[PDB]
Subunit: 338 residues, 6 copies
Amino acid sequence: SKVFIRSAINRVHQNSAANGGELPRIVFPEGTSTKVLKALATLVEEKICQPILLGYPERVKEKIKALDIPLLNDVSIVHPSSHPKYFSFVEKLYSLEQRKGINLGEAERLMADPNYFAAMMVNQGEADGMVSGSSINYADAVRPILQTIGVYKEGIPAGLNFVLLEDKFLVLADTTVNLNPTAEQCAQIALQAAKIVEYFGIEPRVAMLSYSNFSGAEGTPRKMKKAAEIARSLRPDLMIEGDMQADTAVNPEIMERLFPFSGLKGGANVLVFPNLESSNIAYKLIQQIGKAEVIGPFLTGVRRSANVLQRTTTVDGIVNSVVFTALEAQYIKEVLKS
Amino acid sequence: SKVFIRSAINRVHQNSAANGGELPRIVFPEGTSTKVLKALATLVEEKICQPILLGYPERVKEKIKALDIPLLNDVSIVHPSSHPKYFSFVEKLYSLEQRKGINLGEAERLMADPNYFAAMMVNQGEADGMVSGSSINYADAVRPILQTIGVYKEGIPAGLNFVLLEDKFLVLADTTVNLNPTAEQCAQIALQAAKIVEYFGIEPRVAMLSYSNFSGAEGTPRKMKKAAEIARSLRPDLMIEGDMQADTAVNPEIMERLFPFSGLKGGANVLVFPNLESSNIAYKLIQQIGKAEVIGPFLTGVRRSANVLQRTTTVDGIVNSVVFTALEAQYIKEVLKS
Amino acid sequence: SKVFIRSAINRVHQNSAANGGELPRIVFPEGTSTKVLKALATLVEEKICQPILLGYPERVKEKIKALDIPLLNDVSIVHPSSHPKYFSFVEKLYSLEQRKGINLGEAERLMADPNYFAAMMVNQGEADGMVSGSSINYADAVRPILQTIGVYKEGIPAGLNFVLLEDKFLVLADTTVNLNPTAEQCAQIALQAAKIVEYFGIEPRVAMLSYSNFSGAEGTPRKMKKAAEIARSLRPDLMIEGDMQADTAVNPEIMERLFPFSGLKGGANVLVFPNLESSNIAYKLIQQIGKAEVIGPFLTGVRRSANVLQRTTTVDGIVNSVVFTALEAQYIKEVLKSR
Amino acid sequence: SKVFIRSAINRVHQNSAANGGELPRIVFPEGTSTKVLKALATLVEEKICQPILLGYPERVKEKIKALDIPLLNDVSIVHPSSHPKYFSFVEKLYSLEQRKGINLGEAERLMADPNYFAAMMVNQGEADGMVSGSSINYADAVRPILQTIGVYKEGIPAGLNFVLLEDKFLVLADTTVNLNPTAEQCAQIALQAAKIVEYFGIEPRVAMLSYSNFSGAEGTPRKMKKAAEIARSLRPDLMIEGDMQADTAVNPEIMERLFPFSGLKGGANVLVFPNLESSNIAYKLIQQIGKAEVIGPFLTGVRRSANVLQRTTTVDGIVNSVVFTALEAQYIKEVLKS
Amino acid sequence: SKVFIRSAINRVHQNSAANGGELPRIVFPEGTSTKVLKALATLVEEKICQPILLGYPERVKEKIKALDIPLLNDVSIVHPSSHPKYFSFVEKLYSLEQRKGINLGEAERLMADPNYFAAMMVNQGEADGMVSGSSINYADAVRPILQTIGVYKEGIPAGLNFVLLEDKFLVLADTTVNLNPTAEQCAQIALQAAKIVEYFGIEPRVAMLSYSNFSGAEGTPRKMKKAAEIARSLRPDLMIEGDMQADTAVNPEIMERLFPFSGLKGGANVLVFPNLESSNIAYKLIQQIGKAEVIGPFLTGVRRSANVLQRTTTVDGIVNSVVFTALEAQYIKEVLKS
Amino acid sequence: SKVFIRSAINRVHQNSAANGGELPRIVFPEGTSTKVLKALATLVEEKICQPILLGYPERVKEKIKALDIPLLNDVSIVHPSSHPKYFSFVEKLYSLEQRKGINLGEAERLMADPNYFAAMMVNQGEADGMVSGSSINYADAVRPILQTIGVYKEGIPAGLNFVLLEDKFLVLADTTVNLNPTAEQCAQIALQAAKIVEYFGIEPRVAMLSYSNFSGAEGTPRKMKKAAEIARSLRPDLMIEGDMQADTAVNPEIMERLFPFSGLKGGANVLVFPNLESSNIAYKLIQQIGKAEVIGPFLTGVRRSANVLQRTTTVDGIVNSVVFTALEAQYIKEVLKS
């Protein structure tokens, strides 16, 4: 329920009150987006972020009034190629990609794209985070983030979703990025997801999912089994298990009845998938047919706070997303300070 | 929820009358299975089938007595190797597999196993159907069925599940058999699933699922796109579409909003998966954390009625499986009669 | 030298002539390109085409006056998203690409880009041809063209260059598109190049090039041998031979001394390459250290007239390319009329 | 051009003057080859080497007699199987190849062949160098050399050509040996070609060629980029760059205008190719339709002086090859000193 | 011929005496096998082991009486699931394979099979050795052994045969297990077979067989050449050579005449094969038409004494196999004592 | 078994007597080979062929005198490059191979080689057959034969051997040419061996060999099973069976006892192998350790009579080879006749 979301919002507020009442600056490349503007309407009342819109200030304000949203009257609106830092931004993209097939004119056009300008703003500290992708497909939204902000060391870019049940939440990954991760990659995805779960003061219990129950046969079963093993080696305090079926994974009673030798007791709260088909289809089906709220996807593995909305998002979806992006922004900022 | 199930039960009873009051003979290989016996208690109350249990008669009746299930007192009990037709069953399997690495002694040992004896019984018309796999893994349960009964022509063996929502039901396949079906195979899975949906007087609307929305890129998007094309060609009367995401697939509003050129209007009620990981994980997660009853899996494509319980089944699940196994047994009976 | 080009220019003029005097309309996506503007300066004096510039009309006219090029003051300038057919163009692109991962907003942004807009103009007959790619790399320039105009049936997109020697010309293909064409693809490239050579009233004589002389060993020698064979089957009237080395191919005397069984007599004037590396590197090296004129690349296999300049082009290069583009446009116009 | 050859000949004359007046012994397997005979007339009218002819003395001397070239005189003529060291040569070949499917009779028949005899002569110091391949195809011509003389450590056999422009010369490699070299191999070829350029007191400027300008995309662009990086690591003092197009490589002005971040200034004089097709077709087309004198190929990577004439060679071509073979024999001699 | 076999027999008598009066316990899963029983008749006459038969004791007794075999009236007969150690056996198998897809019921059902019970008996020391596989194919017989007894450190499971010539004996491997062993694997098989030949106080001279004589060509020639080199490195005192042909390998005169450089003199007595076709077909053809006695196969690489009979065996074959099973059991027993 | 060989010799005498007394002309490229000459001593006494020796006449006759072989100094001796037909032979090889990387000079050098010249003589009818390879390896001897004479339509070049037992002879193929023949190829080898066996008035009974008995598993079992199937379709009058083990194949009792459904009764006399390792090693092992005489290999599938001695041949071996070569030459000549 929205118990989880309100707890998150309050955690934002304790962080903000803990830092002089400052709010995180969040860039929205899609400054003219109906759904983004409506979500922001809700979001600026509850003091969750300082929003920054990208686009022509004129038609952004004209669509704000068209949409009848008066508390957006004053929000910062930035036109990328008109910004003072534009050309240095361009020189920085060009410098990082001139041996990946990009000439200076192309760097110019790319930096004029709000997605790239946003990613660069976050990289350059002109913002604390960004939220994009309501109007474009995921790959196109995420490419500038990966090229400009990039991943931290031994991290891997991986999408993550929360499934909110009455008792607890489950975490699902990688729901958006990697088609068919290796065992090593699957373990790294488990580690990132585990750390996220720990941030909420929850004990991570991790299952490596398969169509198989503890078979270890060639292909995905041995893949998920060996993923469990690698992960366990990297973090021996954790309950991490696989290969197993999904129902075996979440249902403690089934696990105990059928596989009492298993190291995973009490049901898994972290679900790592073997390929993008299973993760993507699963989160989306649970979101539409199940009676549980699903929030995300959230992009893990990267050096700064940047999340891509799924194109099928709702206005509430965007709201939840901006909330957790704000939390993330605050968290990364503290680490930078230290 | 149970409305659909009660509808099925009444169609079982309505078919049995107008067919001489006959109940389908359903053989259960696991004659001593607790979950099977308890489910059968419910099931013989409801006049759904004549159950035939396989095992050593004294051990069967003494566990019936242990569980104190007084109405499984007169059910038929068969011991495979003591049965009159045992020796001929052995010779028929031996003639079928003597060049697939199986000698006469091995055929004897195999036919003495209840799964194989059950499969043979059904193949030979000594039973109308079978239900197995409550105690063993799916692969092991399904093997004798496939070797002995086999598929009808241009069929493909594929598991299918029902998701029961308040207004409608969804169908998911292939949830159990094929690791990584080709486009041709996926199209066939869609056709089989389609006719199952038609049996209940529902119009089949088919989505070929992917992590992509109409991208047609190399790999899974291209596979499912071309699957949609083959399926459409074989049945130009059906709404069949892909490649698409799951939420796009089921939600008519999202579809209309984002992809109005689509041939699928009003949401899909048939969901065909690109690989076993995605189908298997999806049905089990929807079943465990959503709030829909999920029934199956049911083995489609095969010449006689034979379905394998998932190892994680409950007693109630076994009851549902037997209901639809009964319906299927009846249907296949009239076809044979023709 | 200057002979081949002046003959081409004169052929453009004889074509505009028994046609009402109409000049092909050629669209240029890069309305502000210095090199494009200088080339057009030279070319409009030569009466070969009606140029159309794409871009914001004020930045175009400001670049024209800055370069002090008075003969362009008159020329048509179009801004894609302001143009009347913009939205129907958007709808036609979307309809072409909505199952290739492109949504309507994406079709709009694409059509607002001059490369796509020019491609659609040419496709829709609002222009007779296009010349692009002075400022972007070849893959990016050529993509909108293939997606929009596309190939005619069993055609294959292939870059072609003229090597202009004192007596004769050589044609080189495929110099820009296919990384590693199959034997069937090499054959189709050869036929395309052949018909181009015939257009100038020359008999096409075709060599499938390799690092080997008539070995047929596995890999490329075998590929070019079977290419030579497929080509011959599809056109038994042409001298087509391979696998052979390049000097063997161009030099008639080497051929007759060393491989008299060869079906190619008198030196090849058509050179089909085994992979993109060899064709691309070869034409560029000949152009840089050779003392012969090299023209192109020209995009063959596509249903309408559309050519992509090499990014390393000079002003004269663009002049030549536009000339032969005007020619291609006239020809394709007549074919379109006929069908 | 003419100056280049004249200077090469003069550097031979200085090497000879620096050593008592000794000229390198060069073996010609093709003792009856017309082209070889005329070219030799020229070659020690100009004091370049002591030629050794291989063949049946009577017919080599009768074709010397036919063509009326008579300070080819008492020029040394050796018949392989008649030579005193013939059986010791036979055993040395046998020891080298008895585990490569070569028996004693086979070593005998092979050693009686002038190509093998020549190679062994050079290995054993009965000669200083060899020039062959006027009458047979390159692979066969080069095989005895690679088996008998071999490569120096971490050297790689690679054909090299000079394009003589009369401002400067270019080197092209590998034009004859390797079909599809790895990035590592491309790097080693670059090093070999660089040292040859240094021999003439010129700064080697090295381009790793492609159809791409600094893209690094999968396939050859990534290959040539990673070759340039490897070579730079092995030789931090050299301008080495890639991936790039050919005209980009040779033209300094194009490079500076379009790719100013490049580490290669003033145009490349060393061109390393991604595969044999491109190199072979390039050198040959330049030689036949440009107006630039091209000399070679010359075989680099081998432990002693040995070159293979392209069968399409001219008589002057042979003269040039012998000039540089003599140069190389001298260079190797002083390096052997210390 | 049989000189070798009774020498084998009385040396068995020599250990049984050298440790009191102990006879090895040898378990026979195939208690109702006619050929096994007839063989046991001969074998219990000559005091080589204490035989244990597996099966229902009375149908074993009925088959013993029918065949009129008076010396088996006394032999121990055990029914697996009636045995005291049965469930503990089940549980230790369950623990060994629970992550390789075997649940507790499956482990129960498997342990009820004589092959598995026999393997477990030998592993747990309720027997010293086992002989199986007369009635079932080799793969099925050898599986319980590999799962239960398994391989010793870096050993590899491999079948070995003796060809008994009048002057000498040859050993052939791997005749049963590996389809296409690598060069390393071939080397390990060679080392193992070598220690077997040494046990009989014979000097092992090892040939890595091929269709080639010292060619080292790609495929099998290279593989066997490198196998010889690895083997030689692992064991520098042994004559180990290849790649070579079979006649070259066994015939010393051919070896010296045609390949005198070879490091293997006097003919090979250890023959390692490149793939299973060649070894299997070779041993069988020699046994049938070669007019020589062939004994085995014997399973090498395994931690306890366990051998699988070929299905095509005779009674005499079974007799020989049991003899050497006893020998293997005793050697292993004493080194287990250590 | 000299009965079989003397039957062969006498059947030659009847063929030559039945066509005027003409003996087949057999070319021996190795005119100076000791073993070939000693063999010819035996062979010309018994009127088996008119031998033709290749080489320089003087050193041929001088080794004939050295070896003290008086019955040979009238035998015809041909020096290839001195022969009247040399140039026409050259142009014919050249026309055959000018597009396989062979130039006219290369055609000259090849034709001057005795192996090529012998092959061309036989091809062109200047001889009836050839025998070679006593002194070189099999691939090199067989190459000119395959290039010059070639295969008849849908034939495949395959080495065949006879194993001569008391009662029976066996045929083994392909023992020398194909590394890993497809099912189609194994079938074709079976047909070729079959017609050879029919020639001696024996009924061919064909087994497709494997390490498996009727398993049909992936790899070799499936291959040999489908080979058996194809062969049966191409020759419906023959008993042809597989996959089976070698002892299964040869032993009729093992066959009926264990696989009575098998189509092969009375033991196979034609053994087709799955790969070159197995055939080659089997053939050589039977020849060295089993004492049955082994004759061959003989090259089947080719348009004219040409056989290659194994390099390990004895003199007696060569005599046998020439005998059956003569027979083959006579049969082929009658085929040519009509």
